[PDB]
Each structure stands twice: as structure tokens, then as C-alpha cells.
């Protein structure tokens, strides 16, 4: 099922992602250097319920890092907006990924799902809803 997330990627669109940032409490700096940033994926997983995933974002940012979860357990998470106390935990949702982050009393939430070929993930913080699109490095 997660074989489909799976692979190399790249982003291709995006939109409303600073904003978005925004509402997550992050300073301009990181709203714009986060929107401006061009991260290439490289996902894959054990046993479909154990994903490990990386990005090499770029610049100007330069933040490359890693994700290494089971899905249905929650775990700690050190974004690049800088927030203390960040607790992830993923789901499987039909054919889509939702992974949603808890902080400060709040819940922010990504909904990732593959179309036309293309890993199209929407992000949702309150009425703010921001969004990207990734295709494969041409697989
Ligand atoms: C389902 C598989 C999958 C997973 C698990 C996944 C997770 C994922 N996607 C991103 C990119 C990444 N980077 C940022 C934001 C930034 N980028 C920057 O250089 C800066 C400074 C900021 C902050 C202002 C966000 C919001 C995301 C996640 C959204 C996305 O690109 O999908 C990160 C690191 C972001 C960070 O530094 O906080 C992670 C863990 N993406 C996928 O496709």
C-alpha cells in the first residue's frame, strides 16, 4: 500500500506554504526561506508500518533531515519553524498518508496522496490551507 509513497521525489508546486508557515508560528525568515526552498524526498518503508523517510530541502534554508516512523505510533519531531515540543504520529487513510503534528494545544495536519504521478501533499492549520505538489527525479 505505502509502496506507492515510496521512491524518489521532487518538488514541482507550491502555494500558500509561507502563510501556511505563518500560522505555525514561524518568523518571516523561515515563511519565505521555507516557501523558497526546493526539497528533493527519498522515501521508503519496512513491513507497511514502519516508513523511513529523508530531504535534502536546499537552498536557502540548508535544513536536511529525516523521518523515521511507525505508523499508528506517536513520536517527537524538530521542525525548521523551531517548535518546542512537537508530537507527530501517522496514519493510513484509504490511499492517502495523513501525518498530523500536535503542539502548545494545537493540531496542524498533511494529507499526502499520489496523482497522475505526482505526490500531492495538502497542509491544513485552521482556516489556512497551503499546498504542494512533488514529482519523481523522472523515475
Ligand atoms: C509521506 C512522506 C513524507 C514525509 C514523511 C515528509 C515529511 C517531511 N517533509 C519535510 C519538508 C518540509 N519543510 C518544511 C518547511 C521548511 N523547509 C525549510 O528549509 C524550512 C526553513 C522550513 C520551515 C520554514 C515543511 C512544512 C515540510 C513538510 C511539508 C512538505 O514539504 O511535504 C520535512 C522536514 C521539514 C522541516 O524541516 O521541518 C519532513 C519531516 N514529506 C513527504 O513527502
Redesign the pocket.
Known amino acids: 500500500m505505502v509502496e506507492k509513497?515510496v521512491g524518489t521525489?521532487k518538488?514541482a508546486d507550491?502555494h500558500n506554504?509561507?502563510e501556511?508557515?505563518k500560522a505555525?508560528g514561524?518568523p518571516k525568515?523561515?515563511?519565505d526561506?521555507?516557501?523558497?526552498?526546493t526539497?528533493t524526498?527519498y522515501?521508503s518503508q519496512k513491513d507497511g508500518d514502519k516508513?523511513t523517510?529523508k530531504?535534502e530541502?536546499?537552498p536557502?534554508?540548508?535544513?536536511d533531515?529525516?523521518?523515521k516512523?511507525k505508523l499508528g505510533e506517536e513520536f517527537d519531531?524538530?521542525?525548521?519553524?523551531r517548535?518546542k515540543g512537537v508530537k507527530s504520529v501517522?496514519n493510513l487513510v484509504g490511499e492517502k498518508?495523513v501525518?498530523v503534528q500536535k503542539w502548545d494545544g494545537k493540531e496542524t495536519t498533511?494529507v499526502?496522496e499520489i496523482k497522475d504521478g505526482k505526490?500531492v501533499?495538502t497542509?491544513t492549520m485552521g482556516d489556512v490551507v497551503?499546498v504542494?505538489s512533488?514529482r519523481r527525479a523522472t523515475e
Do not use: K, N
Request: proline share 6%.
Open positions: 509513497f521525489w518538488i507550491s506554504f509561507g501556511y508557515l505555525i514561524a525568515e523561515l515563511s526561506g521555507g516557501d523558497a526552498t526539497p524526498l522515501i516508513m523517510v530531504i530541502q536546499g536557502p534554508t540548508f535544513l533531515t529525516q523521518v516512523f519531531e524538530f521542525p525548521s519553524d517548535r501517522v498518508l501525518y498533511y499526502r505526490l501533499v497542509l497551503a504542494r512533488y
